[PDB]
């Protein structure tokens with residue numbers, strides 16, 4: 512018997528096999544969840560990444576900036592899940608920020624056009640997705656998004672930090688809307704993870720300062736932190752997807768090795 516036995520969950524944000532969403536999807540399927548996966552612009556290549564998952568899963572096209580995609584998403588999911596069946600979970604693992612708003616680039620030199628695009632994708636889309644999917648969610652359901660603790664400023668992450676701050680605020684309002692359906696809405700604030708996205712930033716002064724953040728994180732974390740292992744994060748997301756945190760919503764769960772509770 513698995514944690515998510517007989518639950519229908521939509522997982523978005525799977526770009527590579529190193530994406531956090533892939534490990535969330537992997538662990539979810541290991542725990543008995545029936546999945547619906549979304550992607551964009553490389554569905555042939557994405558499906559082949561998806562094929563490495565334990566179980567087969569339908570793949571739907573979703574650009575969270577496309578209003579037509581969002582307006583038809585709910586229906587397209589139903590034609591895949593089956594009529595009379597609803598979703599029990601939605602995982603939002605989508606974030607983006609142009610180079611000008613991250614890395615070694617001066618914080619002031621990021622034009623708003625780039626920042627607005629990042630915030631649309633990283634923060635506003637969380638509400639867009641909730642708006643589209645809540646009608647086809649069962650009571651007791653769970654919406655989960657991804658987060659990186661933005662309560663304090665930091666190097667390199669720059670404007671992505673701001674987009675995460677907005678996301679945290681958006682989540683609290685999504686929770687108000689989700690409550691009417693009996694649905695919870697939460698974020699998982701993870702410690703630093705070596706996704707291909709972040710791995711690129713490290714290589715592409717800033718990269719050294721990222722290493723300083725990574726090193727300091729593991730030391731600070733009372734139980735340690737492995738940036739190469741996304742599994743503890745994925746299990747945390749699955750925990751929120753289950754029925755074992757049923758009184759938690761509009762909230763943030765920190766899967767960071769306990770680093771945010773330690774100063775030094």
Ligand SMILES: [C][C]S(=O)(=O)N1[N][C]C2=[C][C]=C(OC3=C(/[C]=N/[O])[C]=C(C(F)(F)F)[C]=[C]3)[C]=C2[B]1([O])[O]
Pocket residue numbers: 524531604605606607633657658659665666667668671701702703704705706708709720721724725738
């Ligand atoms: C899920 C996709 S996402 O786009 O929306 N996203 N959300 C959560 C999230 C959580 C942790 C992350 O890892 C880091 C690292 C990693 N170092 O190895 C370094 C820094 C810093 F501050 F040093 F630059 C920040 C986050 C990345 C992401 B994220 O921005 O990819």
